[PDB]
Homo-oligomer: A and B are copies of this chain.
Amino acid sequence: AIIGLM
């Protein structure tokens, strides 16, 4: 699985 934040 894969999250990404900014």
Which residues of chain A have a CB within 8 Å of any CB of chain B? 1-6
Is B5 in contact with A2, judged by CB distance below 8 angstroms? no
Cα A6 to Cα B5 in complex, Å, equals 5
8 nearest A-B pairs in the assembled complex, by CB-CB distance: A1-B1, A2-B2, A3-B3, A4-B4, A5-B6, A3-B4, A6-B6, A5-B5
This chain: how many copies in the complex? Answer: 4
User: Can you list 11 A-B pairs with a CB-CB distance of less than 8 A?
Assistant: A1-B1, A1-B2, A1-B3, A2-B2, A3-B3, A3-B4, A3-B5, A4-B4, A4-B5, A5-B5, A5-B6
The smallest C-beta distance from A3 to any residue of chain B, in angstroms, reads 4
By a CB distance below 8 angstroms, the chain B residues around A1 are 1-3
